[PDB]
Design a binder for this molecule. Structure first.
Ligand SMILES: O=c1[nH]c2cc(CNS(=O)(=O)c3cccc4ccccc34)ccc2n1-c1cc(Cl)c(O)cc1O
Length: 207
């Protein structure tokens, strides 16, 4: 298991997300679905020139899976996925130029929801999750698991769980007071409000 530090601005962003009083936490789902849509756009794009890219799975979709027993909400997509290097590079060790000014804007009152437009919407997961596990499989690498409970670090390890074929699964281990996100009606409402016209099918599983 390898442990990495979050880049300083990323850690600062995570703390802002966890600490700032902001009731509109439901935006986390819109942001994770947006990332899934980008990943699906990318594999679709690559397949236009190389159909064999879809050998690991032809279906391009997003599934939302609540599990009340585990207190988890999982967002699964069959997008391009991430290699180990992609996880490290994109989920914690590098901050895009402009991140410092963006956080200064948040502090002066800009809406936390702007993290999506800026390109750091994944971290919205920490509005509702005490821990996030990201399981991913890219055609060019083996299956990996990234994980973090914030606190300034994340881990990466090869994953031995159920093979995914291709894509990414974000497992949100919900905070005790955020169980509304395991309810069918609540998830349905959020998807309709914020993600109704995504260009790939979104299936909300039930229990
Ligand atoms: O697995 C992948 N591959 C993805 C490829 C892109 C392309 N855009 S990018 O800026 O080049 C970029 C490249 C690699 C990793 C990125 C991670 C986040 C945002 C942009 C990233 C977008 C999302 C991707 N995801 C993914 C990630 C999260 Cl966090 C999620 O919740 C669900 C997901 O499917």
């Amino acid at each position: 298991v390898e442990t990495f530090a979050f880049q300083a601005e990323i850690a600062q962003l995570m703390s802002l997300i966890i600490n700032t009083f902001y009731s509109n936490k439901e935006i986390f789902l819109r942001e994770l679905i947006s990332n899934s849509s980008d990943a699906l756009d990318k594999i679709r794009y690559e397949t236009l020139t190389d159909p064999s890219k879809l050998d690991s799975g032809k279906e391009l979709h997003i599934n939302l899976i609540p599990n009340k027993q585990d207190r988890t909400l999982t967002i699964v997509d069959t997008g391009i996925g991430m290699t180990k290097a992609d996880l490290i590079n994109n989920l914690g060790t590098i901050a895009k130029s402009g991140t410092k000014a963006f956080m200064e804007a948040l502090q002066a009152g800009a809406d936390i929801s702007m993290i999506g437009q800026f390109g750091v919407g994944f971290y919205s997961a920490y509005l509702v999750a005490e821990k996030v596990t990201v399981i991913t499989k890219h055609n060019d690498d083996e299956q990996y698991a990234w994980e973090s409970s914030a606190g300034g670090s994340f881990t990466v390890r090869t994953d031995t769980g159920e093979p995914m074929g291709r894509g990414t699964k974000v497992i949100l281990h919900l905070k005790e007071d955020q169980t509304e996100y395991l309810e069918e009606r609540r998830i349905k409402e959020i998807v309709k409000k914020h993600s109704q016209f995504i260009g790939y099918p979104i299936t909300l599983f039930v229990e």
